[PDB]
Amino acid sequence: GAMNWTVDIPIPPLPTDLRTRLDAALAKPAAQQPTWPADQALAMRTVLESVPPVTVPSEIVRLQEQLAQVAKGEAFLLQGGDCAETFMDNTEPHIRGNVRALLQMAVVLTYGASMPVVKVARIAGQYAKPRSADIDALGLRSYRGDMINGFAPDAAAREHDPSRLVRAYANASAAMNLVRALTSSGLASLHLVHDWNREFVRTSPAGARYEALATEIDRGLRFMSACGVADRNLQTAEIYASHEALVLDYERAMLRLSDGDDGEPQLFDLSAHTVWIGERTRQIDGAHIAFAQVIANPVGVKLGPNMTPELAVEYVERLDPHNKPGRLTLVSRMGNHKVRDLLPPIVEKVQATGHQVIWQCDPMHGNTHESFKTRHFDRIVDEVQGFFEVHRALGTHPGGIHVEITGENVTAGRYETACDPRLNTQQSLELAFLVAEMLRD
Amino acid sequence: GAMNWTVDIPIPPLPTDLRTRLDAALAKPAAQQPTWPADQALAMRTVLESVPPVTVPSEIVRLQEQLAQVAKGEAFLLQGGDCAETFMDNTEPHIRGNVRALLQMAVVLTYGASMPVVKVARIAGQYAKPRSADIDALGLRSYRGDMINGFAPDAAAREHDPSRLVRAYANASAAMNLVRALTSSGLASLHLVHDWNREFVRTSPAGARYEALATEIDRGLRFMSACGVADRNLQTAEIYASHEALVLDYERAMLRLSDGDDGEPQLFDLSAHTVWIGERTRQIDGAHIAFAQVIANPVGVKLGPNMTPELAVEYVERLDPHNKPGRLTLVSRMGNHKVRDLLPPIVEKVQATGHQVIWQCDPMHGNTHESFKTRHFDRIVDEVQGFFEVHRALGTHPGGIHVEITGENVTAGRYETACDPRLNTQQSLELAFLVAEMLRD
Amino acid sequence: WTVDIPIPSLPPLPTDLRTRLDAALAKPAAQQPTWPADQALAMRTVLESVPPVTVPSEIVRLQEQLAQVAKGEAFLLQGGDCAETFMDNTEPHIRGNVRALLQMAVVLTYGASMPVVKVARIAGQYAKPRSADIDALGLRSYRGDMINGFAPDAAAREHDPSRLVRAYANASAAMNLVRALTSSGLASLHLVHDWNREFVRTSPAGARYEALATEIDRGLRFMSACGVADRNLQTAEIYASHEALVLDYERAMLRLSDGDDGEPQLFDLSAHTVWIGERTRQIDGAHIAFAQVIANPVGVKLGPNMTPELAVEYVERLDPHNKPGRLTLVSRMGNHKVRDLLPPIVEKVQATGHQVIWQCDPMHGNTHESSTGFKTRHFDRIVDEVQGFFEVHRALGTHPGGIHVEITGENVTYETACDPRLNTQQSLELAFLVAEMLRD
Amino acid sequence: WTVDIPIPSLPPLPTDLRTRLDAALAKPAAQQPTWPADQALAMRTVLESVPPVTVPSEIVRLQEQLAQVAKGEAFLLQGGDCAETFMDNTEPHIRGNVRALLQMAVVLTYGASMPVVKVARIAGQYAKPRSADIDALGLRSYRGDMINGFAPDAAAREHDPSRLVRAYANASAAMNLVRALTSSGLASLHLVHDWNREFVRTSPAGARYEALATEIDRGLRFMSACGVADRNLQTAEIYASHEALVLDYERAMLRLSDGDDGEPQLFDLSAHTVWIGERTRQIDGAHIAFAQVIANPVGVKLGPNMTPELAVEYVERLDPHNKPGRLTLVSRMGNHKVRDLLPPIVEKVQATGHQVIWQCDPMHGNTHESSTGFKTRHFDRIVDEVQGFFEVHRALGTHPGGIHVEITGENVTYETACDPRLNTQQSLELAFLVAEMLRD
Ligand SMILES: N[C@@H](Cc1ccccc1)C(=O)O
Ligand SMILES: N[C@@H](Cc1ccccc1)C(=O)O
Ligand SMILES: N[C@@H](Cc1ccccc1)C(=O)O
Ligand SMILES: N[C@@H](Cc1ccccc1)C(=O)O
Ligand SMILES: N[C@@H](Cc1ccccc1)C(=O)O
Ligand SMILES: N[C@@H](Cc1ccccc1)C(=O)O
Numbered sequence A, B: 001g002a003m004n005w006t007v008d009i010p011i012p013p014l015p016t017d018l019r020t021r022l023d024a025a026l027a028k029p030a031a032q033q034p035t036w037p038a039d040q041a042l043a044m045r046t047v048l049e050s051v052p053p054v055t056v057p058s059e060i061v062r063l064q065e066q067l068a069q070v071a072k073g074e075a076f077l078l079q080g081g082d083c084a085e086t087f088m089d090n091t092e093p094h095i096r097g098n099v100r101a102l103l104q105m106a107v108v109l110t111y112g113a114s115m116p117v118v119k120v121a122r123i124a125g126q127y128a129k130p131r132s133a134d135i136d137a138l139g140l141r142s143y144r145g146d147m148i149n150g151f152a153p154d155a156a157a158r159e160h161d162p163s164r165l166v167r168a169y170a171n172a173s174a175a176m177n178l179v180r181a182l183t184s185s186g187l188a189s190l191h192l193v194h195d196w197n198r199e200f201v202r203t204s205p206a207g208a209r210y211e212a213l214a215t216e217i218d219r220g221l222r223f224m225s226a227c228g229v230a231d232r233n234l235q236t237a238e239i240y241a242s243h244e245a246l247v248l249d250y251e252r253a254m255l256r257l258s259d260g261d262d263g264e265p266q267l268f269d270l271s272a273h274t275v276w277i278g279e280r281t282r283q284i285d286g287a288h289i290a291f292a293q294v295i296a297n298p299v300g301v302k303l304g305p306n307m308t309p310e311l312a313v314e315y316v317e318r319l320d321p322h323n324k325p326g327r328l329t330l331v332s333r334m335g336n337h338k339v340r341d342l343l344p345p346i347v348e349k350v351q352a353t354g355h356q357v358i359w360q361c362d363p364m365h366g367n368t369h370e371s372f373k374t375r376h377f378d379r380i381v382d383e384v385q386g387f388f389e390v391h392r393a394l395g396t397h398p399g400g401i402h403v404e405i406t407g408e409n410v411t412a413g414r415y416e417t418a419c420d421p422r423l424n425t426q427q428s429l430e431l432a433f434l435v436a437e438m439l440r441d
Numbered sequence C, D: 001w002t003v004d005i006p007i008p009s010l011p012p013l014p015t016d017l018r019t020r021l022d023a024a025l026a027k028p029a030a031q032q033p034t035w036p037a038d039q040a041l042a043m044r045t046v047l048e049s050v051p052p053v054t055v056p057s058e059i060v061r062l063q064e065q066l067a068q069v070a071k072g073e074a075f076l077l078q079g080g081d082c083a084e085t086f087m088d089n090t091e092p093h094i095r096g097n098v099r100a101l102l103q104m105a106v107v108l109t110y111g112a113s114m115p116v117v118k119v120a121r122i123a124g125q126y127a128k129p130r131s132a133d134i135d136a137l138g139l140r141s142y143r144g145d146m147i148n149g150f151a152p153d154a155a156a157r158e159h160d161p162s163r164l165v166r167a168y169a170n171a172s173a174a175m176n177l178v179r180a181l182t183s184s185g186l187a188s189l190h191l192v193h194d195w196n197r198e199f200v201r202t203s204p205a206g207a208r209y210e211a212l213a214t215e216i217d218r219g220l221r222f223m224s225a226c227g228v229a230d231r232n233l234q235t236a237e238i239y240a241s242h243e244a245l246v247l248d249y250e251r252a253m254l255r256l257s258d259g260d261d262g263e264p265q266l267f268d269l270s271a272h273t274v275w276i277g278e279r280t281r282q283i284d285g286a287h288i289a290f291a292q293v294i295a296n297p298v299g300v301k302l303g304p305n306m307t308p309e310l311a312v313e314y315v316e317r318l319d320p321h322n323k324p325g326r327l328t329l330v331s332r333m334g335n336h337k338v339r340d341l342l343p344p345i346v347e348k349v350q351a352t353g354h355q356v357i358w359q360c361d362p363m364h365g366n367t368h369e370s371s372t373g374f375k376t377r378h379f380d381r382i383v384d385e386v387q388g389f390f391e392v393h394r395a396l397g398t399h400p401g402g403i404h405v406e407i408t409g410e411n412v413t414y415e416t417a418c419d420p421r422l423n424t425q426q427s428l429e430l431a432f433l434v435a436e437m438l439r440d
């Protein structure tokens, strides 16, 4: 035990069809991958290839059904969590933080939309982010998430390390065990959760505003206890896991094949329930999009300001070839100032295809004035506002949102994140309220 | 079949103790009984003594538990229905009217009190009312309900007729079968019921006011459907039956003895679930109050303006000798103008006894200016207002209310009742809203 | 000592559905009462506006369960008094027959390993046909309390239409009670079997059944250990039924659904399901015409004279829309004749495409007429018909649907005012026996 | 080819509870690893702040079910791998042992006619005592993957404290999966018994069990016909357990409840329940001292050398508060010695007032050591102990609580890296046999 734990490499074949496809996909050019040696990556993949999965097909299929309801406009999608999971914060309080944070948004939003909210946390493997420049502001190789290199500002720590593939799984599966433990404990009781909201509402300086709704919601709660409905849901509370499918070494290693009680056998990425593809890795003929086609998980794709209705439709037809509403989620990150002019044309040409995607709003990644990397709240709310305004007009469904938040209240002073200043626990709850009023009108 | 159906007189003894008691009770002087011959009343009682009961002990015991919660201040009592059931209106639409009417009050009030509402309809035997003068305004023997004589304004019809004891049961048990059928059908689905309220709220000229709450309530509903709670209550909807225990010939004939899975054997009045005793028949040493002591049903007693804290306490100790919270309900009918000064002293001296009664407000019987017999709405609301104001101050629980209403919208013009102009379907729903706001504050 | 009791017509039924009804009842009716039309009209008018015994949503739901019964996924269990009398229309008598029925349900539910739809011969069985116009004492035959009285006197035996109203008052009072009982602890699955377990200790025919009687207990206890909400369940929905004989009563009780569902259609709210008897099933008579007009799930008695071709004609009049379970063909041949006579029918009927429910009635078809004056039925002959009834079906791979039984809660052997039958302890014993038939 | 993997201490545990802990661990410990204290400290520090394998509300709920187990209303079912290896810490292996366990649960649940609390030997069983300091090949004895490695080489056999962290990573990954599986269709009661029914067709020891195997099916089908919500249920709560041997690991995993319930108390969140082995139960040793400090439901192995007086001393150290089910005394005597040795203990223990759970461990106490080199256990000798274990209890009218079994999903016979045992088909077979013991 020389300052670090030592795991040892492990000394049933794929259907020919899925082997060929998976191999054809990975053969394609891949953006933003790590630059460590394949000989070593091969070893880590081997270790990983027969570890216990983070999630299981049955849950992924159940997600797929819930997502449909969302896609069909009878439910709502709340995806949110850390901007970037760090191995260092992979702790019980942190994980309990983001869950408490995510659930508090769910009750409010659920009462807002007057329909079920699907809860997808950014968690259990959000360990790898993409970057534009390979060298960063200090003259070092960019930090690309704990799965690839280290935050520490020195070249040594920034050297891409294959070991971090395994270390990433260890942490992910351990975080995922707690989230299972938490959601199925009383941590997820509907009213133990709304106590917190009424707490926030008294202590918040900017609580006056929500005093209103937060009361109305408590009456909706106490009312359903009145009509004789015991927590005995009620449905047991479900938080699904997700992260950007970036590191294809990692993502492939965690592929597992289904048995055969759901049509035919097929590949499932069991590093999470749902995964999406980023703006900087969505090349239409790319390996990421190809990989998206091969797995049976629900998949989202980010859509930036240079997105064209034509292209958007190409994604919808490759990623959802069988027309299964909810399989595909089109995540919009335009930026408040553009989102109203850019989105509507994209939405018409898409709806026209007959396919039913989930229109999720990403109000984060769009808006950044760079004060550190500052993001003004009003700008975030504004984008989700416009995002609704677009769907209302065209008569489609504003499917859900994608927020980057945390449990520890962050701002100089409090800059704790290993990436970007986002919304703090407070702001995100406060955003949940504002967005709840948008669902009302 | 000479213009009328002919039933034929029927050609297991009481425990000595209950025989003696019941006989001692009836031996006492009785106010407001009918003046037909005992030889004939004996015959009707015989017929009745072995007919199928309207209610069964198990339901009465279950009521007793629900009433406790109400008495303990964790539930609310909504008692209401026809002022006076008539054999002529004992029809499917009428009965469906009062139930629809009673349930619509229940959802609103339940959302108001943010706790369960017990639903007791005046029904299935509210066929006998008391009167002050034996001769009435036209020079005829007073009409005392279809169980005793007839509404028709002629001496012939006013002759007290024993047959009406049986005719009263036939109708009661038939009405009670429908109410069972109705509440267990979809007639009692929570949302099929609130559709009506949102209907009333658009069509009502005076709906603006409630547009507010009626919306908030619909969101509380849609919210509990969101959190994944199927009507599959939910508790199946329960409406209990009740009426003024006035005609002791009738009431005794419908006594039945319990088996022995609830302590010892004891007498139950199975003409209804709960019955109360009127202002004009509550003589403390009276036969009605004695009869109240003998049966194991929950019993209410009306309390007029001449009621004294001392007397009130005597009722509480005779009618609730074992301290079973909820057995006894003290119904207040003071009159808005007096209720605030008269009630509070009564409430203190009672609470002081350690017993826990249900404080139900009767805002009807108090207020009558006699334009017909006119009752102004604002005066009714005012009494329930003051009734709350009293309990709030002393810190006790405003237990429930007792309203006299109907399904057909009544006012000259529309005077349809066989007794008093009360609240119409509309006014009573409107009263349910006003009273819902009193529970909120 | 009797006591006559006195007596505003709401809106009448649609003119269009009425014309159809009229056209229907215009057919000749069999075995009807011989009272004045005028008096009979008055009484119909009373009942035209009373509270109904059942309601439409109940019937529309029964039909749904009857669909599964007919699709070979559930079992029918019809049973109750041979003849309801007004005098026994009491609390212990109904408590009894409800109890006997539920006990049978529990054992057959476990035996068939599928839901048992519980239909009770109750709240309305107050009329019976008579092939004897003058009886054995030389009085006008007794035709049920809905028509005349059992008392062997000329006066009592004269058909009184007020008995229409008296019949209602008792049917609604009786139904008010089964509702109450069935929705309280009287239909608690656990409490219900306790009565069976004690039947196994206290019967001489006990050692035979103790085996299975224990198995059922461990099934019950097994699901308590699994922690399944008592709080079902379905509580124990018991539907009401009777033979639809006196037409004046059944038409007064015709009501129209409100039509927030489907369209507007006639229902007979005197009951949930009704059937039409062996002697009143004339294909072009008023009774089948009636069954056509009403929406209720309907049944027909089939005897030894039945010809598969006619049995088909019923499948086409009654279930023209092919709604599975709408029509239940009840078989009452006789153990000796069941095995030979039934199959040809099944085949011809199954060939129509329609899905009927196949119920067995081993009661009427098996009756000996004892040597001590008292009429009687034999128990083995009864079990046997049900046995053969199953064998017939097993062979053709069709679904033996259920049984129709004339039983009682009181342990009697002759305190009935009609035909003989089984007793509490005998029907329970039968359920056990039909229970083993289901297992194979 | 291996791969080392690198490594902010949150607030430490209360000073007051720490002093108690210190005082406790100061006692001498048996069968502990011989690594450097410094290195062992580093590793403890890692684990001092990781995510826990269980959480307190889970343990506080298990305790509640264990209270009923001890009050003779439920049954304990402990079972799983003899020794978890890191290399078999795979998806098919855990799917297997979870499956084997649930199958056993179904049969015993029905047999005992009462809830069975399912506790799995999983997610943490990575250490074992050794009465042999040098093994048969002359290498430092293998002491579990948590301590050293199975590979017969000197290097691998040296105690490495990084195995503390590796042990956690696998225990949490493994627990992450049982959660997933147990909350999906893998613990569907119906789907679970399907695997049993097929065991009755495809076993040679089938005709023996088909009887009961059918009964269980009809129990299942009976409750489907009653219309009980699948949607339980409890889904199938499977608790994690292992022998608490390596103390450095168990103390790192000590966490403090947040105290919105009760007071603040120590829990060992490395598992749900843990037990203390025959060789490390020294009354004044560190291992019992540990059991005192932690709140988890605890158990102790009792062998042939046990003296009722000492057994009592356990009842008083461990369950000083008399919380029913807190302490489970496990018996591993031996079929030949169970019947004579156990009773005196029960009596002396029941006499204290305290309510312990009485679990039976017919695994260690029954082992022959075969004549072909391979160590082995005999199956009949195993059933017998459980038999006698029941007889002992029946006689004294005390409650035989449950069994502890070393089993597996894979049908093996010697692919384990530890002691011998039963196989999937053998444990299932045992559950059936213990199932009939419960019925009498
Ligand atoms: N997150 C810490 C501790 C840890 C190790 C392994 C699994 C889970 C957590 C690390 O990587 O060192
Ligand atoms: N039954 C609710 C419980 C819940 C709601 C919101 C937050 C947390 C828990 C659900 O599953 O949605
Ligand atoms: N992980 C393998 C594919 C695979 C998936 C599932 C089972 C077996 C193999 C690869 O990347 O090529
Ligand atoms: N209410 C009517 C009809 C009726 C009769 C009997 C019972 C129920 C209703 C009457 O008394 O005449
Ligand atoms: N579950 C509710 C249903 C209901 C509420 C209000 C009115 C009607 C029905 C109750 O029993 O109270
Ligand atoms: N009805 C009887 C009393 C009684 C009640 C119940 C059973 C028997 C008798 C009476 O008034 O005297």
Ligand SMILES: N[C@@H](Cc1ccccc1)C(=O)O
Binding pocket: B007, B008, B047, B051, B052, B170, C086, C087, C089, C166, C169, C170, C173
């Ligand atoms: N069963 C008696 C009394 C009764 C009358 C009306 C309804 C129910 C019962 C009869 O019918 O004559």
Ligand SMILES: N[C@@H](Cc1ccccc1)C(=O)O
Binding pocket: C102, C103, C105, C106, C109, C116, C187, C188, C189, C192, C232, C233, C234, C235, C236, C237, D225, D226, D227
């Ligand atoms: N819910 C069960 C209850 C029951 C079954 C059988 C007998 C009695 C009661 C049913 O209605 O089928």
Ligand SMILES: N[C@@H](Cc1ccccc1)C(=O)O
Binding pocket: A007, A008, A047, A051, A052, A170, D086, D087, D089, D166, D169, D170, D173
């Ligand atoms: N089971 C392998 C790989 C693994 C590592 C970490 C957690 C789970 C599995 C080992 O422990 O060496």
Ligand SMILES: N[C@@H](Cc1ccccc1)C(=O)O
Binding pocket: C225, C226, C227, D102, D103, D105, D106, D109, D116, D187, D188, D189, D192, D232, D233, D234, D235, D236, D237
């Ligand atoms: N709810 C049952 C489900 C179950 C029982 C037995 C085996 C498998 C599953 C239980 O946890 O007890």
